[PDB]
């Protein structure tokens, strides 16, 4: 019913030692080692603080997590493993867990980040192709390790803005990909969720990550955050079709037959497509050029085989400013 456009022979290509997370060993490290200092985040299934290695005496995250759906721990353990040494992906510095419980926690590299709702809006039009390129590197290479983050947002990118430097975190909703699996569509916060995820369609695949980036874009270049904003999952597939337009979500249904649930029925309109120039004012203009506008539209399609891939989205002409600025630097 979908395979993906690339990337789909990754997992069969590295071994089932790349994939089966089941039947990973972990090799705890000494939970005594690390002093919880403060509190800087919190989750869903989880607590963050800042922390010491106290044999290096040296800053770190510590998250802990709460549930024990045993092999989710497992799957996260085994993806940040996997994803060593890739541009802007956090490092994993360790995993510990405490004797008595066995409640596990992850400890990562601590990234001096500023929240987005105060950072985005001190970007310059180069800060965002730079930091969206960064971005893109992050999601094309454990998109070419056959990983799908599944939870891209701006609070799972960090951002040193005095260092330059971009992390993406919290892959707790990370998965690997295999070609026709169903996955869960139950992923990614409201806000950034795929149509697809929305109308219950399974057999989704990296090019989820690309819309999820989309609306980060979309909301940094016209200031709206968020930028699809429904108050339900339901609502939120009415706000994306406002935009959009209802005839291209119903060529979309047809193409891949999805069968739109019958709530939708009172609550969906006829939409036309409102065009992404309505979205441009005065306060949010710095960010807007042409190609900015062609990039967020190849982005946020219906169709997830009609998106960039991370690969293609760095080719872009929006980003040559920063290829270049990178090869002078060079
Ligand atoms: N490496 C890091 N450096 C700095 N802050 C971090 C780091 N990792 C996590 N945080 C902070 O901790 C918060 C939650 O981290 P996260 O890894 O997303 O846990 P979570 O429970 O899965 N959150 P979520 O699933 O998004 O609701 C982030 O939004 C940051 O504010
Ligand atoms: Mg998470």
């Known amino acids: 019913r979908s395979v993906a456009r690339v990337y789909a022979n990754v997992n069969e290509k590295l071994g089932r030692s790349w994939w089966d997370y089941d039947?990973?060993?972990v090799q705890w490290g000494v939970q005594d080692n690390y002093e919880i200092v403060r509190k800087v985040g919190r989750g869903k299934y989880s607590e963050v603080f800042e922390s010491i290695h106290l044999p290096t005496d040296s800053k770190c995250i510590v998250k802990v997590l709460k549930p024990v759906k045993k092999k989710k721990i497992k799957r996260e353990i085994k993806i940040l493993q996997n994803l060593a040494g890739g541009p802007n992906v956090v490092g994993l510095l360790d995993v510990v867990r405490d004797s008595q419980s066995k409640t596990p926690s992850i400890v990562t590299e601590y990234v001096n980040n500023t929240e987005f709702k105060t950072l985005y809006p001190k970007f310059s039009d180069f800060d965002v192709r730079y930091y969206i390129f960064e971005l893109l590197k992050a999601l094309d290479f454990?998109?070419?390790?056959?990983i799908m983050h599944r939870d891209v947002?701006?609070?799972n990118v960090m951002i040193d803005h005095e260092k330059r430097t971009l992390r993406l975190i919290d892959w707790g909703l990370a998965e690997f990909y295999?070609?026709?699996?169903?996955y869960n569509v139950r992923v990614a916060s409201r806000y950034f969720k795929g149509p697809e995820l929305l109308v219950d369609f399974q057999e989704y695949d990296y090019s989820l990550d690309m819309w999820s980036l989309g609306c980060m874009?979309?909301?940094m270049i016209f200031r709206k955050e968020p930028f699809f904003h429904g108050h339900d999952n339901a609502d939120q597939l009415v706000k994306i079709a406002k935009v959009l337009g209802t005839d291209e979500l119903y060529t979309y249904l047809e193409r891949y037959d999805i069968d739109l649930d019958a709530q939708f029925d009172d609550i969906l309109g006829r939409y036309p497509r409102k065009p992404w120039?309505?979205?441009?004012?005065s306060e949010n203009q710095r960010y807007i050029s042409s190609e900015a506008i062609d990039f967020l539209d190849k982005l946020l399609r219906y169709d997830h085989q009609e998106r960039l891939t991370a690969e293609e989205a760095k080719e872009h002409p929006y980003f040559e400013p920063v290829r270049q600025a990178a090869a002078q630097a060079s």
Do not use: D, I, M, Y
């Not at 454990?142 to 056959?146: D, E, I, L, P, R």
């Not at 295999?178 to 169903?182: I, L, M, S």
């Open 217 to 219: 874009f979309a909301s």
């Open 153 to 155: 947002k701006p609070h």
């Open 277 to 281: 120039s309505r979205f441009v004012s």
């Open 142 to 146: 454990c998109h070419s390790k056959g």
């Open 178 to 182: 295999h070609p026709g699996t169903e």
């Open 23 to 25: 039947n990973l060993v």
